[PDB]
From a paper:
Notably, Mu variant has a much lower B-factor in the RBD region, relative to its NTD, indicating that the RBD in Mu variant is structurally more rigid. The majority of S trimers from all strains have all three RBDs in the closed state (hereafter, closed state), ranging from 73% (Mu) to 88% (Delta); the Mu variant has the most populated 1-RBD open state (hereafter, open state), constituting 25%. Using this approach, 30% of the S monomers in the Mu variant are in the locked state, while the locked state was not observed for other variants. In the locked state of Mu variant, a 10 Å displacement of the NTD toward the center of the threefold axis was detected. This 10 Å shift allowed a newly established salt bridge between K113 (NTD) and E471 (RBD), keeping the RBD and NTD more tightly packed. The Mu variant has been reported to be about 10 times more resistant to antibodies elicited by either natural SARS-CoV-2 infection or mRNA vaccination as its parent B.1 strain. The prevalence of the locked state might contribute to this behavior by altering the conformational distribution of the antigenically vulnerable NTD. Our data do not provide an obvious structural explanation for the presence of the locked state in the Mu variant. The D950N mutation induces a structural difference between Delta/Mu (which both contain the D950N mutation) and B.1, indicated by >2 Å Cα RMSD. When aligning the HR1 residues, the position of loop 940–945 in Delta and Mu (N950) differs to B.1 and there is a change in the rotamer conformation of K947; these changes are not observed for Alpha and Gamma (D950).
S glycoprotein trimers protrude out from the viral membrane and are the major proteins on the viral surface, making it the main target for vaccine design. Sequential cleavage of S at the S1/S2 site followed by the S2’ site within the S2 domain exposes the fusion peptide (FP), which mediates host-viral membrane fusion, allowing entry of the viral genome into the host cell. Overall, the S-trimer structures are similar to those previously determined for B.1 in situ, and are similar across all variants.
Residue numbers in the entry:
A (entry chain A): 295 to 622, 631 to 676, 689 to 735
B (entry chain B): 736 to 827, 848 to 1078
C (entry chain A): 1030 to 1148
D (entry chain C): 736 to 784
Write the structure that this text describes.
Amino acid sequence: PLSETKCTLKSFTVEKGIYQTSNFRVQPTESIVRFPNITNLCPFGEVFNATKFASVYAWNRKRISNCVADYSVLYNSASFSTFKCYGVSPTKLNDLCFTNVYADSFVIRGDEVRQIAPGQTGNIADYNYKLPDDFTGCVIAWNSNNLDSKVGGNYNYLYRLFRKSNLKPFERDISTEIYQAGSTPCNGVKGFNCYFPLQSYGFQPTYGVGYQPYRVVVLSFELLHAPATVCGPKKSTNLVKNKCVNFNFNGLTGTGVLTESNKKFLPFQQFGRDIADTTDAVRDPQTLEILDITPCSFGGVSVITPGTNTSNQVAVLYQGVNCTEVPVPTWRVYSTGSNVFQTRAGCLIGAEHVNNSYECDIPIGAGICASYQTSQSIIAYTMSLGAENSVAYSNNSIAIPTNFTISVTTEILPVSMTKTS
Amino acid sequence: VDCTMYICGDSTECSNLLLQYGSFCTQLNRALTGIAVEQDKNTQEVFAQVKQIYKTPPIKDFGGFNFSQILPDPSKPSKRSFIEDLLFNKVTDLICAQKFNGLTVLPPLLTDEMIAQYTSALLAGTITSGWTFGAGAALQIPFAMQMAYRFNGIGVTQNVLYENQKLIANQFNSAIGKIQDSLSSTASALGKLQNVVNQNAQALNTLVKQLSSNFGAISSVLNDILSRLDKVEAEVQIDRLITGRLQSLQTYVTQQLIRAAEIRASANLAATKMSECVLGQSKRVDFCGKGYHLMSFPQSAPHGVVFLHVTYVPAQEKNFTTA
Amino acid sequence: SECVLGQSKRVDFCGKGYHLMSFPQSAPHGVVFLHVTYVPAQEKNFTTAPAICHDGKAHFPREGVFVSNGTHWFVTQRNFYEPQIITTDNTFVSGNCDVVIGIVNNTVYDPLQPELDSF
Amino acid sequence: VDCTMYICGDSTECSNLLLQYGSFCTQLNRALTGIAVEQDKNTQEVFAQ
Ligand SMILES: *[C@@H]1O[C@H](CO[C@@H]2O[C@@H](C)[C@@H](O)[C@@H](O)[C@@H]2O)[C@@H](O[C@@H]2O[C@H](CO)[C@@H](O)[C@H](O)[C@H]2NC(C)=O)[C@H](O)[C@H]1NC(C)=O
Ligand SMILES: *[C@@H]1O[C@H](CO)[C@@H](O[C@@H]2O[C@H](CO)[C@@H](O)[C@H](O)[C@H]2NC(C)=O)[C@H](O)[C@H]1NC(C)=O
Ligand SMILES: *[C@@H]1O[C@H](CO)[C@@H](O[C@@H]2O[C@H](CO)[C@@H](O)[C@H](O)[C@H]2NC(C)=O)[C@H](O)[C@H]1NC(C)=O
Ligand SMILES: *[C@@H]1O[C@H](CO)[C@@H](O[C@@H]2O[C@H](CO)[C@@H](O)[C@H](O)[C@H]2NC(C)=O)[C@H](O)[C@H]1NC(C)=O
Ligand SMILES: *[C@@H]1O[C@H](CO)[C@@H](O[C@@H]2O[C@H](CO)[C@@H](O)[C@H](O)[C@H]2NC(C)=O)[C@H](O)[C@H]1NC(C)=O
Ligand SMILES: *[C@@H]1O[C@H](CO)[C@@H](O[C@@H]2O[C@H](CO)[C@@H](O)[C@H](O)[C@H]2NC(C)=O)[C@H](O)[C@H]1NC(C)=O
Ligand SMILES: *[C@@H]1O[C@H](CO)[C@@H](O[C@@H]2O[C@H](CO)[C@@H](O)[C@H](O)[C@H]2NC(C)=O)[C@H](O)[C@H]1NC(C)=O
Ligand SMILES: *[C@@H]1O[C@H](CO)[C@@H](O)[C@H](O)[C@H]1NC(C)=O
Ligand SMILES: *[C@@H]1O[C@H](CO)[C@@H](O)[C@H](O)[C@H]1NC(C)=O
Ligand SMILES: *[C@@H]1O[C@H](CO)[C@@H](O)[C@H](O)[C@H]1NC(C)=O
Ligand SMILES: *[C@@H]1O[C@H](CO)[C@@H](O)[C@H](O)[C@H]1NC(C)=O
Ligand SMILES: *[C@@H]1O[C@H](CO)[C@@H](O)[C@H](O)[C@H]1NC(C)=O
């Protein structure tokens, strides 16, 4: 502890005093994982490997639900030529859970894959398929010239070329209404400045990559306070309660002591929150009991020292900590029962609790002070307020001073401080 | 404040980014420690002026003056006076959320029992020895005789004290009863202590509320960021949280430094009134209450001192021709 | 202003004890005041009374306090034991003896009476 | 200070971003209000004796 003092002061000498050197924290005994007990594998092959994809103006959507997804198979597949994730990291994705996953799937030009991203604009982003600016999900695309082209061109794939407005996020518009580019109306028929709003892609196999077909899937992840139904492949551990632990509940990483809760969760509620947004309680996804989450205990570590010229002996106060909590800072050699004293300032280690009272030398708090005293060691005591005295009052007695002493008392006052620019 | 635990919780990823801000957390911890050491000094300079713990005599023959409402009451182990109980049961938030988010309250060095024992000694010295225990050793004097010295001190001849001693004692006892009634029932006078307690509770509450702020990150919950993003992506969001939480904690520390300066100005004034009104008789016109100052009695209050200023107020004036 | 350029009645403002005078000394970024104070010492117990009853009149000290060594009564200044005979000069009269709680009987020396009687 | 009118003017796009900083504008308004209430108290304690 004297070394943590010397370091926090950045000094080899330490004056007499009490110094914050560290904060103590109880370390986790083990790491829990709790996902729902789902064995059904997710049908990603059904969306990524269909014989025929949708046109982007009429883009397909499929719910992925109540299933286990090994997204690392997707990301480490060499086949996908782009695999861009937003609001999530694809490595981390294998240990999250989601209320649902929506797979959106369609075909576009290779040039247009850049438009399938949050905050994009362009013919596809504006008139066919819009991701929200705060999209969480991954966009997965691959060249499909060996599938979605044919000689003479694949007219089966269409895109909306015109609309009166650009789309809202995840809006779809299959409407066949002939579109007015003209100043005059179209009267419901084609004409000058009056066009069918969909155009087909030329997908001749001969075309360069910017005009080759690309199949696209957008895995959209709904992170909600709703229960999880899609999860990564990570296996649930058993639960442990009063031991300090790391945990993962449906992707809620945290640490604490999982006390069995008294809190009366309504059947829809999945998590409890503190006054800060930190998680205060959690429902177990398998047993559906309620657990409190409280942090493993912690506190300031004040080191009590005489000057290093006087001694290298030091006592340690675990501030606000209980002596039933202090572990046998960085070092392990304290909490020896030979010197333990539960002050209201905290558990005090390495000082002898004497019965006397003296003037306060080093303050500890809640009436406690410590000093280095004889065979010298750190003593802790209730500070003395002064000599207790009886004035000898009487209704007819007076004390009159028969002499005097002239006293000279030094008073020092700061007047200025150093002028700086 | 455990500045690392406030800003980062238990995340080492955040802690390692918080190292890149350098000494800011050490500056914050050191400023709050200086404020805390000042609060002990403020209490010491107000109450621990009395060099000996004077005890009152067992029999209270103070010439008809009745201090029983302001002298220590043995019936409680805190050993407060009755009026001290009125104060401690009248001035006296979110402590659990604060504690779990790195914010903690240190106890004062002097307990309320020790502060009550200092006010006890100041009262005993005052009524048994007048001002003399301020200047030196306590010299006993009968209470009616030192009250007659107070009357001379306000320029009223001491025979006016002795010729009216029963009246003056009845008036004092009645006015101490009015202190009891007012402090039992008012909603106004204690506003100076309530305001200080409210300001500090509000400041800690606000500092905890700032942990819910996104500061433009994808979540205010730092464990959401670290469960959902890996280092290169997460660091941008963790840095947004670090920036806003460090600005929140610096705002708190700055305003605590300003409040501590105001509380020290108030403790300097309280220490000056202990010296000049309790240990003395002040000629300073309003310094020890309205009227000509006779004497003052200290009472402890939560984080505060109460002075009961006894003053002579002239009454029933008559018109005279003068030359 | 109040301790160097003056003498302060303010109890602790210029050191512990009754302030006599103070001397300023310069210090780095500071001032040092050497406060000279009178501290009373070697106090003795006396019996005391608020008033003397004499000839049915009540006498009070003009300044100071009445004290007895056990057998005789004196008047003295409050902050230094310097006993004086109780006289009609260092006391003033107000009213009769009946009203003062704890008044004591003693002779009060009139100094003019013997200056007549010795003429 | 109308902290939203100072930082953002009448823009709601800015106002909605300024909400993400949490209570800072409430802290600022409350500090300036405490200063203003103190200025009345300072004048009362000097003159209304
Ligand atoms: C003042 O006197 C008291 C006790 O009074 C005694 O009887 C008087 C009639 C007179 O003869 C006094 O001189 C006597 O002393 C002293 O109080 C005692 O002090 C001692 C310590 O010195 C203590 O052990 C006793 O318990 C005290 N008794 C009481 C009743 O308080 C007091 O010390 C005298 N003051 C001075 C300055 O000497
Ligand atoms: C719900 O229905 C309304 C009306 O059918 C849709 O309104 C369209 O709104 C956009 C602008 O947001 C306009 O450009 C379209 O012209 C509107 N259509 C019609 C026929 O008036 C609305 O978009 C629909 N919302 C969803 C989510 O489908
Ligand atoms: C330190 O911890 C102990 C328990 O480990 C506390 O003592 C217990 O307090 C509860 C009341 O909350 C009692 O019901 C128990 O009987 C007590 N047990 C023992 C063995 O005393 C103690 O109060 C704690 N002290 C501090 C300062 O935190
Ligand atoms: C001094 O004043 C107190 C005022 O509280 C008196 O205390 C009361 O005394 C009676 C008995 O005489 C008790 O029944 C009451 O309960 C007391 N009140 C309290 C609040 O304690 C006390 O009697 C007075 N003493 C003298 C000598 O005047
Ligand atoms: C001085 O004022 C006091 C009141 O503060 C007067 O005392 C009251 O006198 C009435 C009768 O006139 C009594 O009923 C009250 O009980 C008295 N009060 C107290 C506290 O004793 C007193 O008479 C006044 N003296 C003069 C000379 O005017
Ligand atoms: C109280 O003081 C008086 C001082 O006057 C003492 O009496 C005097 O003693 C001297 C001798 O020392 C005599 O010569 C005087 O005649 C005495 N005075 C008078 C007026 O007769 C007295 O002894 C003291 N008493 C105590 C108990 O100390
Ligand atoms: C002080 O002197 C007066 C006399 O001047 C004493 O009063 C007398 O006391 C007796 C009883 O002891 C009565 O019988 C007399 O009537 C009183 N005289 C007068 C004129 O009232 C008084 O007792 C003396 N005090 C002390 C303490 O001895
Ligand atoms: C798609 O089907 C082929 C068989 O034609 C298979 O080899 C391949 O692994 C499948 N891809 C996916 C992603 O399931
Ligand atoms: C999931 O596991 C828990 C035990 O951890 C069990 O009680 C529960 O019935 C299981 N749920 C289902 C749907 O089988
Ligand atoms: C340092 O310790 C030595 C003894 O080892 C002692 O003589 C000296 O006075 C001490 N000085 C200070 C400044 O503590
Ligand atoms: C210290 O004080 C307590 C009582 O306050 C007592 O139980 C204990 O035995 C004392 N220890 C010594 C060594 O006197
Ligand atoms: C002191 O008390 C006694 C009774 O014990 C009484 O006779 C005397 O008048 C009182 N003296 C004073 C000054 O109050």
